[PDB]
Write a protein that binds this ligand. Structure first.
Ligand SMILES: Nc1nc2c(ncn2[C@@H]2O[C@H](COP(=O)(O)OP(=O)(O)NP(=O)(O)O)[C@@H](O)[C@H]2O)c(=O)[nH]1
Ligand SMILES: [Ca+2]
Ligand SMILES: [Ca+2]
Ligand SMILES: [Mg+2]
Ligand SMILES: [Mg+2]
Length: 166
């Protein structure tokens, strides 16, 4: 069956792990345990196609920035996550995109921009700002909450549908 290699990237604490765990295991991780690098696999049906999602959950802590080149090499599509209550995590997106762009030597890498924690009211990144960033990359913007599950499947499935346009 078709295998899709997804990689979830973004600053520390934006909810990369919570998003992936919500998708794969259907519960919300409330505590914060910083990730080094974890892998998840699950067979799903997306638009009538049975496929395997291989998801790499990466480190947001800058300490582990050295490991980025390896995972950017292998991944087929990237979920670029920031938190809507964390302006710095939004500003950090470009450095993730730029590295992906260098490594793939492509301006057309399948990606989705994800604004997570949309359940929180302390918003400092407005949807329109994020829409504009995504537009400049030629990719979709989707808001999510790993807490409520809002948008979680849409984000990952959209990344699959982007990989399929490439
Ligand atoms: N309210 C709310 N909290 C969230 C959401 N997603 C993650 N969190 C919380 O934010 C904290 C960090 O989540 P986590 O998934 O560990 O972040 P991360 O991006 O994987 N961190 P790291 O890069 O260090 O591995 C946790 O307390 C988690 O419960 C969300 O959508 N809503
Ligand atoms: Ca929990
Ligand atoms: Ca692009
Ligand atoms: Mg994590
Ligand atoms: Mg503002």
């Amino acid at each position: 069956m078709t295998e899709y290699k997804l990689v979830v990237v973004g600053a520390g604490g934006v909810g990369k792990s919570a998003l992936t765990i919500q998708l794969i295991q259907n519960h919300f991780v409330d505590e914060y345990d910083p990730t080094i690098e974890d892998s998840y696999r699950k067979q799903v049906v997306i638009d009538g196609e049975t496929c395997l999602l291989d998801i790499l959950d990466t480190a947001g802590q800058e300490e582990y920035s050295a490991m980025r080149d390896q995972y950017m090499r292998t991944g087929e599509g990237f979920l670029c996550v920031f938190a809507i209550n964390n302006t710095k995590s939004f500003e950090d997106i470009h450095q993730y995109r730029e590295q992906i762009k260098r490594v793939k030597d492509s301006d057309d890498v399948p990606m989705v921009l994800v604004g997570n924690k949309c359940d929180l009211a302390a918003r400092t990144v407005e949807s329109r700002q994020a829409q504009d960033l995504a537009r400049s990359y030629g990719i979709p913007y989707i808001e999510t909450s790993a807490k409520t599950r809002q948008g979680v499947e849409d984000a990952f499935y959209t990344l699959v549908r982007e990989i399929r346009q490439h």
